[PDB]
């Protein structure tokens, strides 16, 4: 049972701008997704200080980067707080509406796309390199969900039947044909070292067989 939703007009406009603007410095997408993962990990860590049972779904707090050349995907996995169905359909888009407006105003004033994370909408930088994004997520208070969008104004949400995750979020970037450099070990290592060297959680870059 797949539900299809329309993006708000302003968010659809932001994704079209990201997909269509000429902008060579695409590698910042990885910093933005790792930053998101680190915030989600901060949130479950802090909540667990006053309710230890929130880690019954997994004590390890980490981030894994998994490239797969056969599927042409880069997966960013974290064991953070995860996202509820209401987050996926309502709450994140409500926050993202005001952040997008602020970001668009900044861009017209002279800013560049690399500053997107200062406006809370860094997730959408995934579409610098991905033709489709799939998000699998599990919050302690809800079921496991799959969110998916190839832009074009709509996204889907369904209950996910795959491998149970325990808790956290998996972002699967289905890369554009000319962006396969982000599947190479040496390239991912360079980007993490350059932009994410002080993240307070272990980042494991998986290697391919
Ligand atoms: C803003 N947004 C969405 O609307 C749904 C999927 C998602 C995942 C992560 Br992780 C961060 C933000 C989003």
UniProtKB/Swiss-Prot annotation:
Protein origin, superkingdom: Eukaryota
Effect noted on mutating residue 32 to A: Strong ATP-binding. Strong interaction with HSF1, HIF1A, ERBB2, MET, KEAP1 and RHOBTB2. No effect on interaction with TSC1
Gene Ontology biological process terms in this record: activation of innate immune response; cardiac muscle cell apoptotic process; cellular response to heat; cellular response to virus; chaperone-mediated autophagy; chaperone-mediated protein complex assembly; mitochondrial transport; neurofibrillary tangle assembly
UniProt effect for mutating residue 78 to A: Impaired ATP-binding. Strong interaction with HIF1A, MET, KEAP1 and RHOBTB2. Loss of interaction with HSF1 and ERBB2. Los of interaction with TSC1
Keyword match Transmembrane helix: no
Keyword field: Acetylation, ATP-binding, Cell membrane, Chaperone, Cytoplasm, Host-virus interaction, Hydrolase, Membrane, Mitochondrion, Nucleotide-binding, Nucleus, Phosphoprotein, S-nitrosylation, Stress response, Ubl conjugation
Broad class of where this protein is predominantly found: nucleus
Subcellular location: Nucleus; Cytoplasm; Melanosome; Cell membrane
Keyword Metal-binding: no
Residues with PTM N6-acetyllysine: 43, 69
GO MF annotation terms: ATP binding; ATP hydrolysis activity; ATP-dependent protein folding chaperone; CTP binding; dATP binding; disordered domain specific binding; DNA polymerase binding; enzyme-substrate adaptor activity
The record's account of how the chain is modified after translation: ISGylated. S-nitrosylated; negatively regulates the ATPase activity and the activation of eNOS by HSP90AA1.
Function: Molecular chaperone that promotes the maturation, structural maintenance and proper regulation of specific target proteins involved for instance in cell cycle control and signal transduction. Undergoes a functional cycle that is linked to its ATPase activity which is essential for its chaperone activity. This cycle probably induces conformational changes in the client proteins, thereby causing their activation. Interacts dynamically with various co-chaperones that modulate its substrate recognition, ATPase cycle and chaperone function. (Microbial infection) Seems to interfere with N.meningitidis NadA-mediated invasion of human cells. Decreasing HSP90 levels increases adhesion and entry of E.coli expressing NadA into human Chang cells; increasing its levels leads to decreased adhesion and invasion.
Quaternary structure and interacting proteins, as annotated: Homodimer. Identified in NR3C1/GCR steroid receptor-chaperone complexes formed at least by NR3C1, HSP90AA1 and a variety of proteins containing TPR repeats such as FKBP4, FKBP5, PPID, PPP5C or STIP1. Forms a complex containing HSP90AA1, TSC1 and TSC2; TSC1 is required to recruit TCS2 to the complex. The closed form interacts (via the middle domain and TPR repeat-binding motif) with co-chaperone TSC1 (via C-terminus). Interacts with TOM34. Interacts with TERT; the interaction, together with PTGES3, is required for correct assembly and stabilization of the TERT holoenzyme complex. (Microbial infection) Interacts with herpes simplex virus 1 protein US11; this interaction inhibits TBK1-induced interferon production.
Family: Belongs to the heat shock protein 90 family.
This protein's domain notes: The TPR repeat-binding motif mediates interaction with TPR repeat-containing proteins like the co-chaperone STUB1.
Name under which the protein is recorded: Heat shock protein HSP 90-alpha
Organism from which the protein derives: Homo sapiens
């Amino acid at each position: 049972e797949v539900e299809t939703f329309a993006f708000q007009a302003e968010i659809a406009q932001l994704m079209s701008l990201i997909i269509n603007t000429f902008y060579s410095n695409k590698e910042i997408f990885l910093r933005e997704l790792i930053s998101n993962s680190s915030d989600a990990l901060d949130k479950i860590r802090y909540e667990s200080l006053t309710d230890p049972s929130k880690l019954d779904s997994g004590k390890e707090l980490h981030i894994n980067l998994i490239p797969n050349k056969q599927d042409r995907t880069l997966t960013i996995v974290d064991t953070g707080i995860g996202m509820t169905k209401a987050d996926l359909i309502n709450n994140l888009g409500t926050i993202a509406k005001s952040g997008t407006k602020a970001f668009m105003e900044a861009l017209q004033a002279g800013a560049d796309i690399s500053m997107i994370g200062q406006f809370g909408v860094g997730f959408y930088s995934a579409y610098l390199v991905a033709e489709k994004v799939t998000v699998i997520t599990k919050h302690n208070d809800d079921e496991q969900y799959a969110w998916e969008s190839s832009a074009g104004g709509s996204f889907t949400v369904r209950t996910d039947t795959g491998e149970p995750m325990g808790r956290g979020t998996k972002v699967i970037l289905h890369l554009k044909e000319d962006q396969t450099e982000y599947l190479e070990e040496r390239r991912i290592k360079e980007i993490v070292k350059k932009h994410s060297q002080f993240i307070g959680y272990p980042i494991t870059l998986f290697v391919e067989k």
